[PDB]
Amino acid sequence: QVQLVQSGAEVRNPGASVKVSCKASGYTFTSYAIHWVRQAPGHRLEWVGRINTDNGNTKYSQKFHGRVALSRDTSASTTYMDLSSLNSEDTAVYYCARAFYYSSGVMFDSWGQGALVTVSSAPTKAPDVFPIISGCRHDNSPVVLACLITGYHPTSVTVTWYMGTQSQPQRTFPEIQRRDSYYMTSSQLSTPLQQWRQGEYKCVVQHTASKSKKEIFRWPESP
Amino acid sequence: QSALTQPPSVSGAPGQRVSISCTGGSSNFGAGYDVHWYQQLPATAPKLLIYGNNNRPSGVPDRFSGSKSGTSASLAITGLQAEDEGDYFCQSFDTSLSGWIFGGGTKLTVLGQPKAAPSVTLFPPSSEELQANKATLVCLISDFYPGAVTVAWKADSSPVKAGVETTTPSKQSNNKYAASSYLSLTPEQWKSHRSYSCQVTHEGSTVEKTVAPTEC
């Protein structure tokens, strides 16, 4: 059977390099070309290049330009992708596909499992917690309390809201990596607030990676 | 155009017929290159689904059918099965870029519960954050099914796409989904506009919330 296997996941610093392999098996390695495709989180798939697995001719995507290089080793039955001068946008999963022919053109009939590459230069840091609020305390519009949790590394955090001593239902939200390789997420108190009490409700943020617990029990008067 | 366009979400009851549209530019579909379709099941490599407009590899069920005419192609899936739930995208070739091009991707959901439109709350920058010379708008989205939305920001009436960082949907404890989107701004830009608006789109309806610097 036709099967493509790639190297494991890599973690690098900004401006560095990474070399990911793509081992083929089950067919003639020099008969069919190999392409490289990446997909960033929140983006579609992006083509990198095609390498002629026989004479060695390579065609690169114009967007990458001098950043990427595609090599071949026929004896090793493997293709490589070397990407230099990394940055936050290069955090993606990199695939390799085989070019197979059909009656009218070119076809990708086999894809690798993919290799994740993370461009992170973040030390273990505790999160900053800011009290955010929706609505006025001056209207009959309900007030929604939330806590903004940004500037930490690594994942994850653990949030619990409290009214005095009892725990209160909350809403969990995903965590996203920012451009500066730091993470952030939010937590929202579920029940909308009818009245105004001072110091009654509080969000508690726990980040065991830095052995710290940061809690907020006051929402300042609005700007 | 020089790229493909797909609906972000396509839903269907178990057993019904659904459709996915791939819109192409003259430089691609009007350029003689046929369209390929690939499915990406959860945590799997993309699988070749349909090659050459309407041909089917040995291993793909006949429920998947393909068509292409003019400049728009459509992928049809009859008798919807729970195994079909995943992401689907189209591929072609462009002559102006001399390279391959892919579509935005479409999440197919097999309904297991009735649909729920998202509930949205928009948050202004906090007082403590502004004193730290920072400003971030928080758009929180929760309790929607199927799990796929599209967030669009705008300053006053003009759209803004810089500094937007949206999260992928994550299944909640009650099989519904939640997401969020953030607009990072400088404290100068925040007070330099009369209002900001988060715009969430989901299954044929868009809800928008607005916050103003002068508001509270």
Numbering used by the authors:
A (entry chain B): 1 to 138, 141 to 225
B (entry chain A): 1 to 216
Text of the article:
We solved four crystal structures of a human anti-Phl p 7 IgD Fab: Fab1 (2.75Å resolution) solved in space group P 1 with two Fab molecules (Fab1A and Fab1B) in the asymmetric unit, Fab2 and Fab3 (1.55Å and 1.45Å resolution, respectively), solved in space group P 21 with one molecule each in the asymmetric unit, and Fab4 (2.1Å resolution) solved in space group P 21 21 21 with one molecule in the asymmetric unit. Like Fab fragments in other antibody isotypes, the crystal structures of the IgD Fab reveal a range of Fab elbow angles between the VH-VL and Cδ1-Cλ domain pairs, from 128.3° (Fab3) to 228.3° (Fab1B). Structural diversity in the Cδ1 domain is seen in the AB (residues 133-146) and EF (residues 193-202) loop regions, particularly around Arg137 (AB loop) and Trp198 (EF loop). In Fab2 and Fab4, Trp198 packs against Leu147 and Leu195, the plane of the Arg137 guanidinium group is parallel to the plane of the Trp198 indole group, and the Arg137 side chain forms a hydrogen bond with the Trp198 main chain. By contrast, in Fab1B and Fab3, the plane of the Trp198 indole group is almost perpendicular to its position in Fab2 and Fab4; in Fab1B and Fab3 the Trp198 side chain occupies a similar space, but the overall orientation of the indole group differs. Instead, in Fab1B and Fab3, the Arg137 side chain faces Pro222, and forms hydrogen bonds with Trp221 and Pro222 main chain atoms. In these molecules, Arg137 still contacts the Trp198 side chain, but the position of the Arg137 Cα atom is shifted by ~3.4Å compared with Fab2 and Fab4. The plane of the Trp198 indole group is rotated in Fab1A compared with its position in Fab1B and Fab3, and Arg137 is partially disordered, but the Arg137 Cα atom is shifted as in Fab1B and Fab3. In Fab2, Fab3 and Fab4, the Arg199 side chain extends away from the Cδ1 domain. By contrast, in Fab1A and Fab1B, the Arg199 side chain is oriented towards the surface of the Cδ1 domain.
